Design a protein around this ligand. Structure first.
Ligand SMILES: *[C@](=O)([C]([C][C][C]1[C][C][N][C]1)[N]C(=O)O[C][C]=[C])C1=NOC([C]C2=[C][C]=C(C(=O)[N][C]3[C]C4=[C][C]=[C][C]=C4[C]3)[C]=[C]2)=N1
Ligand SMILES: *[C@](=O)([C]([C][C][C]1[C][C][N][C]1)[N]C(=O)O[C][C]=[C])C1=NOC([C]C2=[C][C]=C(C(=O)[N][C]3[C]C4=[C][C]=[C][C]=C4[C]3)[C]=[C]2)=N1
Ligand SMILES: *[C@](=O)([C]([C][C][C]1[C][C][N][C]1)[N]C(=O)O[C][C]=[C])C1=NOC([C]C2=[C][C]=C(C(=O)[N][C]3[C]C4=[C][C]=[C][C]=C4[C]3)[C]=[C]2)=N1
Ligand SMILES: *[C@](=O)([C]([C][C][C]1[C][C][N][C]1)[N]C(=O)O[C][C]=[C])C1=NOC([C]C2=[C][C]=C(C(=O)[N][C]3[C]C4=[C][C]=[C][C]=C4[C]3)[C]=[C]2)=N1
Lengths: 243, 243, 243, 243
């Protein structure tokens, strides 16, 4: 997370940390609890190649990473089949936990938007996570969960920005239709936030508009953050995740 | 190059080394001379973002890197407008030297193939460069130009193998048509060879069939190397390079 | 600490951590509270060259590094005038706090030994700290305080071992008189523990026998840990720390 | 070498390069040819712990390291018995080649100074090597052999310099009698030059006055290069090396 700051402990009850087995269960990606037994994340965080579930764990809402670890095993990794790379698209995945979690004020699901929802450009949204606080710049210990207010941006406008200073032809799609974008040169998500959530308060309730996907660096000029548009894959998600 | 030997002084007279400015003019990609004023290379070596031409130079064939440097300035960098990432495709580009080079037995251009050339399996080809000699293993000083004979396989054979051990649907094409496939777990090109040539001997003449592009690691099981299919972009090349 | 276990919250009330300014107040060495206003540590941790005091801070006993920081500023760095390198000797130093500390059962001083105490082999001694759990292997987060019981051996026994597999002449002392040795190939202190305490229970009381100094690697064969012998420097310590 | 330049092909015909086995025979220290079959160097380059000879080699005068390599095996490694660390002293050693090298105008021995010889402070001397061109920054490829003119300085005046900005007491020796110093904030030897020679032209003839040993950083303020004084160990060398 670039810009923004440490999050109050009562905020973002659905944020989660993905841990991979090594000298210690290390955080490699963010995620979100969208259902007592399901975690929404970014496909590249766990794909394209097949993974060994034995080496993966999910950590629910934690104020400071690693301090009060309570690792939860995963039973299934469902990576969207159209995924191969973040730039191409369909960068979204599902993690089924072996046991549902006992929700509470402190830890509970976030809500998916309805297939109609669109989130207008210049709409206040928040992205959260434990990622780098800047290009090649780790979040130092005690590893607090961070948050930043980032403005949504019209799909075509981000595509347009990504063509500036680039040899890529203007009519060649870079930011694709299954993507969403937010951020500026001051506020943005970075490495370590991947698979994390982008949420916006709509009519007084929180909806996940996106999943932290990719981008050319973090908060770079004319290089806004690119996210996997959630509304776009709701049908795929609901094929596994009960309504 | 993985699984090769040091190349003799009389071979690959068209090989070139691209140099980036820094504490010293470091080698970051390969290339090939297709004309006294033009060099063929990979688009991901110089793009998708526009670079400062000043920080780039070209070194013509050397037996060992940095020892007999005679760096040459570049006046133009032309990247195929279709390019953005190597996996997507169109990983091809051109460089125009500020002056034409005097050709000879030790350094002359390579012949481009006719639009109808296929390069089918069985037919032996070679790939050259100064890249790593294995995953994460840099070429050791004095940095000799290496060569290796690589087996060519049909595009659909490689595509099917890139799906083995992957979540990507067998239906989603990975190895695209503007691409060419070669190598195995003992012979392959690695990081540092990108942009360099892949040549096959046809009717006694040497033809550049590909441009070192990408792959999942080097010489890895079920992940043969992927090269930009040169015949697919001939028309584009001729919009800049004389026939 | 090498080959230990995580330490209980009620043990080692004198153990402290030294922090140096940077992206965050990072732990670089260990120490011990010997007086409400004084901290004992290794001279190599803060010298031989004079440092900017403002850039230094001291953290009192903590169960997990960085979790609950309450950094305390330092007004004076006092390094034994005889120190230059640890192998040579006099690897001892004093830190005076700008303010005295309020002691309790969780945070109190350690008892220094009487000038005549020896600590012969077969004595119960422990060494604590936040250092590496092995050679080039950092203590993984949440960074718990570790402890390990180390076997103490006579100086001449360690001096002879350091000579095995070495070109240094036998009559050329390596482990010097103002030094003490402990540990084996399974129990030792490592990088990061430097300056911390080595305590031994003697007749119901805990006494600081030495200060973690140096060694060739950690827990390496014939290379036991070497500590500055505290009894050797009582007179010096007392020219600053009131009796 | 800091603040110097590439050496003319016909200077320092005695400079040598020490190679250690690994992915390739990498340079780790310098040395000098003092007899057709003996190489003078620093003990900290090959000790204090015993090394395996099969892993060591010797490369003679080379304009560019690694280019025209012709490694020579070493029959024996003689490390002064009083050596343990560079700061303590006796940082000198001898390498006995398996064969006598055939001297020539381009490759011959340097001369040892007479026991009574005293290089006056201010003496115009030269230090050669392939070490870093500055603190933490390697010598770029093609790795030319550098040289720099460094002024010798009085042993006492250096000891004093090293106490400035240091807690070490004034009457406590840092720069000892078996050492000598040279260089300033613009001219000095650096990591990789260790074991190399420090020659001075005396009465029309080159004498090796020092062996690159140690120092705090390279070219740092009030931290001149410290070298093992050769004259001091003439008797020890002649005990092995003929006349
Ligand atoms: C992401 O955090 C970044 C975010 C970039 C910002 C988003 C908006 N502004 C910029 N995305 C990124 O780097 O995308 C690259 C796409 C081309 C991120 N951090 O790290 C990654 C890549 C990554 C690193 C490591 C892993 C991993 O270790 N996964 C484990 C390995 C494993 C072994 C056994 C069992 C399970 C697993 C999963 C995965 C991805 N992206
Ligand atoms: C390529 O060598 C690899 C080859 C992989 C093998 C092929 C067959 N088996 C595997 N490909 C690769 O890494 O692909 C990545 C995905 C597309 C290679 N090595 O490094 C790259 C990437 C790269 C590294 C460095 C630069 C660079 O520094 N370019 C300079 C920057 C600059 C500034 C000013 C002026 C000019 C320049 C060019 C570019 C690309 N690919
Ligand atoms: C010590 O932990 C090791 C312990 C080794 C074991 C003991 C028994 N078995 C082996 N000792 C060591 O490495 O000694 C080396 C010399 C002989 C240790 N870890 O790191 C050190 C050295 C060291 C590293 C870093 C600093 C430092 O950064 N100090 C800061 C700089 C600064 C600037 C401004 C204000 C204050 C400061 C302090 C210091 C020492 N020893
Ligand atoms: C020396 O180049 C530096 C020079 C510093 C300058 C001198 C005047 N201004 C500063 N000295 C140094 O760092 O001293 C530190 C002492 C306290 C140098 N560079 O690196 C070293 C240390 C060193 C590194 C590596 C080796 C080595 O690899 N030796 C091999 C290991 C081996 C295995 C099998 C068979 C043979 C060998 C030899 C040795 C020393 N000093």
């Amino acid at each position: 997370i670039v810009g923004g700051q440490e999050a109050p402990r009562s905020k973002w009850p659905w944020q989660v940390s993905l841990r991979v087995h090594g000298p210690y269960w290390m955080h490699f990606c963010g995620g979100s609890l969208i259902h007592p037994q399901w975690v929404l994340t970014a496909a590249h965080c766990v794909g394209p190649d097949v993974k060994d579930l034995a080496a993966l764990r999910v950590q629910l809402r934690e104020q400071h990473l690693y301090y009060q670890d309570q690792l939860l095993p995963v039973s299934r990794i469902i990576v969207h089949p159209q995924f191969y790379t973040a730039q191409i698209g369909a960068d979204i995945a599902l993690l089924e936990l072996e046991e549902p979690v006992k929700v509470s004020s402190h830890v509970h699901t976030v809500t998916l938007p309805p297939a109609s929802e669109t989130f207008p450009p210049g709409m206040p949204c928040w992205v959260t996570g434990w990622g780098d606080v800047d290009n090649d710049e780790r979040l130092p210990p005690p590893f607090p969960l961070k948050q930043v207010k980032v403005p949504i941006m019209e799909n075509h406008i981000c595509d347009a920005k990504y063509h500036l200073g680039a040899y890529t032809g203007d009519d060649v799609r870079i930011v694709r239709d299954d993507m969403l974008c937010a951020g500026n040169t001051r506020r943005d998500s970075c490495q370590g936030d991947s698979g994390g959530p982008l949420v916006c308060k709509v009519n007084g309730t929180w909806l996940q508009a996106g999943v932290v996907s990719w981008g050319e660096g973090c908060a770079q000029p004319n290089r806004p953050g690119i996210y996997t548009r959630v509304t776009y894959y709701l049908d795929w998600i609901h094929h596994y995740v009960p309504k």
